[PDB]
Amino acid sequence: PHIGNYRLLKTLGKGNFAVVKLARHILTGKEVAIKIIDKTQLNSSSLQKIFREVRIMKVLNHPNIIKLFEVIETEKTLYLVTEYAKNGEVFDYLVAHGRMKEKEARAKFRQIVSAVQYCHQKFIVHRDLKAENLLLDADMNIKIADFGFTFCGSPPYAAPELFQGKKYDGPEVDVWSLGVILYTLVSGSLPFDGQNLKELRERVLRGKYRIPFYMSTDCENLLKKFLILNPSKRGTLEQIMKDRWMNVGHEDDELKPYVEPLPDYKDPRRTELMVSMGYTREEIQDSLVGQRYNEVMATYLLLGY
Numbered sequence: 047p048h049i050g051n052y053r054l055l056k057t058l059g060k061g062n063f064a065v066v067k068l069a070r071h072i073l074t075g076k077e078v079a080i081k082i083i084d085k086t087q088l089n090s091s092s093l094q095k096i097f098r099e100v101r102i103m104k105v106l107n108h109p110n111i112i113k114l115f116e117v118i119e120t121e122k123t124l125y126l127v128t129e130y131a132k133n134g135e136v137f138d139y140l141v142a143h144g145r146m147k148e149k150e151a152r153a154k155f156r157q158i159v160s161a162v163q164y165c166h167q168k169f170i171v172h173r174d175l176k177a178e179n180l181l182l183d184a185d186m187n188i189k190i191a192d193f194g195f196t197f198c199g200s201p202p203y204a205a206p207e208l209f210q211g212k213k214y215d216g217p218e219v220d221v222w223s224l225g226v227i228l229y230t231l232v233s234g235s236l237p238f239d240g241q242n243l244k245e246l247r248e249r250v251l252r253g254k255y256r257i258p259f260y261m262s263t264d265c266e267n268l269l270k271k272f273l274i275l276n277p278s279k280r281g282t283l284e285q286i287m288k289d290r291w292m293n294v295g296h297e298d299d300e301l302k303p304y305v306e307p308l309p310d311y312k313d314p315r316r317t318e319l320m321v322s323m324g325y326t327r328e329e330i331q332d333s334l335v336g337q338r339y340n341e342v343m344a345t346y347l348l349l350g351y
């Protein structure tokens with residue numbers, strides 16, 4: 047049960063393409079998730095998508111997005127070592143506990159909106175936002191996952207453009223799915239449903255949904271800023287951040303675009319511990335400035351917890 051500096055612990059998910067395992071980084075003692083991809087079993091276009099996802103993961107550094115720590119490549123197998131979100135998916139938490147009170151849904155939703163807006167700053171569109179892709183860490187903080195690697199709960203989140211044959215590429219697609227996510231957080235149910243796809247599509251294209259009796263007028267006013275049939279009439283996430291419901295109980299701390307902190311490759315506390323482990327100062331610096339995502343860089347990132 048061993049890959050690089052990691053002790054393979056248990057299986058968190060399985061497939062024909064990839065196996066996600068829980069693991070312990072031996073040097074630091076931290077638990078991580080490791081996606082193990084047999085590249086020989088991939089189709090013609092699947093490896094291009096996996097490589098695109100790796101590229102996106104390397105650039106995203108947000109407290110509410112699953113952080114990548116290491117990439118290990120061999121001819122046949124690709125290993126992606128990422129952050130482990132102990133409390134599973136928001137989807138399962140909603141099934142287990144029911145709807146969140148607006149105060150609890152607000153805490154989660156401010157983190158989700160911050161994360162998706164931060165992706166949009168770097169021209170990254172998720173296109174598959176759903177409760178299944180929103181994970182929860184040990185402190186119940188949101189951790190967004192899946193930027194390329196299928197539709198078990200995907201159709202209820204699809205923007206009307208999918209069913210109209212129109213383009214499905216802009217950030218406005220994510221703005222629609224975020225309205226569906228807000229709806230499930232506060233109701234435990236989906237705004238657009240059906241028995242088959244024909245029934246789902248009719249409801250999505252009509253754009254009408256039930257307002258549950260307990261929903262506040264402030265919450266419904268916010269939902270109407272996301273669930274707009276015309277993609278060109280949907281507001282940006284930067285504009286939506288200024289909404290009243292978003293900031294109830296955050297009168298000081300208004301939600302605004304995330305400002306990524308500047309890189310710190312010379313932390314003396316971590317550099318000293320790494321030198322004691324056997325790494326050299328030059329090994330540490332070259333790995334960090336080159337953004338290598340190798341075992342040295344991974345140890346520096348893992349030591350930041």
Ligand SMILES: CN1CC[C@@H](COc2cnc(C#N)cc2-c2ccn3nc(NC(=O)C4CC4)cc3c2)C1
Nearest residue numbers: 058079081126128129130131132134178179191192
């Ligand atoms: C459809 N859903 C399945 C899971 C999620 C996709 O998960 C990932 C995808 N890509 C990478 C990479 N590289 C990494 C993860 C990941 C990152 C962190 N975690 N914490 C967990 N935690 C648990 O399973 C807890 C025991 C319950 C699982 C996971 C999985 C979306």
